[PDB]
C-alpha cells in the first residue's frame, strides 16, 4: 500500500478529480504570488521615485 498524498497517481487511482483540484491550487497560489509582489513593488517603486 503506497501512501496517498506522498506519491501521485495513487491519489489519482482513487480520487481522479484531485489532479485538477491541484492545478487549480498551483495556479492560484502562483498568480496571487504575482499579484502581491507586483503590487508590493508598486508601492515600493512609487516611494522610491519620490527620491
Amino acid at each position: 500500500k503506497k501512501n496517498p498524498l506522498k506519491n501521485l497517481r495513487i491519489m489519482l487511482k482513487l480520487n481522479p478529480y484531485a489532479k485538477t483540484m491541484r492545478r487549480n491550487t498551483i495556479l492560484r497560489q502562483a498568480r496571487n504570488h504575482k499579484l502581491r509582489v507586483d503590487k508590493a513593488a508598486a508601492a515600493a517603486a512609487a516611494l522610491q521615485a519620490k527620491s
Binding site: L8, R9, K19, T20, R23, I26, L27
Partner: protein, 236 residues
C-alpha cells in the same frame, strides 16, 4: 514530430487541462477510423541430391539444464545506470574551486570545469600548481569553496568523455604461471596522448588564474584542520 504543447509546472502535471487539450491538439478534426522468416532454402551443391534444403537454423538447444529458475515479475522499469539523471548541487558552477577529499590527493584544491555525461564531475588543478591531471572525481566527496574563477568561455575539447577516463585489463592467459597476469608489472603507457592534451587545456587556465593575486598560492597550498578549526564554523 512535435513539441510538448502542455508545458509542465509540477513534475507530472500539465498546465493545460483535459478539455483545453481538446482544442490545442486540434483533435476535433483528426478523429479516425481508417483501416515468420526462420530463413529461406539453401542449395544442396551435390550429386544425386536435389530439392534444396530446409528453412531451418537456430535449432532446439543441445542440453537442457536439470533445474530451472522461474522468470522475474518485472514490476517497473527501474531503468539502468546509463539512463538515470544528472544532478549537481546548488553550490557548484564551472570555475568553482574544490577540495579533494577521498582521493590520493586529500585536500589539493582544484578547479572545476564541467560535469560529465556520467555523473563524475571533471576537475583539474593546473599541473603547474598542483599535481592533478584531468582526473574525474565524485560529486559528493568534494567541497565547494565559495571563491570562483572566470572560465565562462574558455574551451573544452569534444573528444574526452567516459571512454577517455577508464582502465584496461584483458585475460589472455588462463594458467597459474609466475607472471603477474602478463600486464601487472607494468605502469600504463596511455600517457603518450594525455601529455599533449593537458597543455591543450592547461595553456588557457593560467591567464584566468593569475588575474587575482593571491590565487596561485591558494591552489599550491593544501587543506588541514588543526586547532581551532571546526567545520561548522567555516564557510567553505
Amino acid at each position: 514530430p512535435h513539441c510538448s504543447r502542455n508545458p509542465v509546472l509540477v513534475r507530472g502535471i500539465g498546465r493545460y487541462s483535459r478539455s483545453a487539450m481538446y482544442s490545442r491538439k486540434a483533435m476535433y478534426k483528426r478523429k479516425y477510423s481508417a483501416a515468420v522468416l526462420a530463413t529461406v532454402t539453401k542449395p544442396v551443391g551435390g550429386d544425386k541430391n536435389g530439392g534444396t534444403r530446409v528453412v531451418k537454423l537456430r535449432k532446439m538447444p543441445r542440453y537442457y539444464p536439470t533445474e530451472d529458475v522461474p522468470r522475474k515479475l518485472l514490476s517497473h522499469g527501474k531503468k539502468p545506470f546509463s539512463q538515470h539523471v544528472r544532478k549537481l548541487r546548488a553550490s557548484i558552477t564551472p570555475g568553482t574551486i574544490l577540495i579533494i577529499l577521498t582521493g590520493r590527493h586529500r585536500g589539493k584544491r582544484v578547479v572545476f570545469l564541467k560535469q560529465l555525461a556520467s555523473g563524475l564531475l571533471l576537475v583539474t588543478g593546473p599541473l603547474v600548481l598542483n599535481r592533478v591531471p584531468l582526473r574525474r572525481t565524485h560529486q559528493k566527496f568534494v567541497i565547494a569553496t565559495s571563491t570562483k574563477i572566470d572560465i565562462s568561455n574558455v574551451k573544452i575539447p569534444k573528444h574526452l568523455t567516459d571512454a577517455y577516463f577508464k582502465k584496461k585489463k584483458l585475460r589472455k592467459p588462463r594458467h597459474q604461471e609466475g607472471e603477474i597476469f602478463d600486464t601487472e608489472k607494468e605502469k600504463y603507457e596511455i600517457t603518450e596522448q594525455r601529455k599533449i592534451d593537458q597543455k591543450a587545456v592547461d595553456s588557457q587556465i593560467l591567464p584566468k588564474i593569475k588575474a587575482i593575486p593571491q590565487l596561485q598560492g591558494y591552489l599550491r597550498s593544501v587543506f588541514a584542520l588543526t586547532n581551532g578549526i571546526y567545520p561548522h564554523k567555516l564557510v567553505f
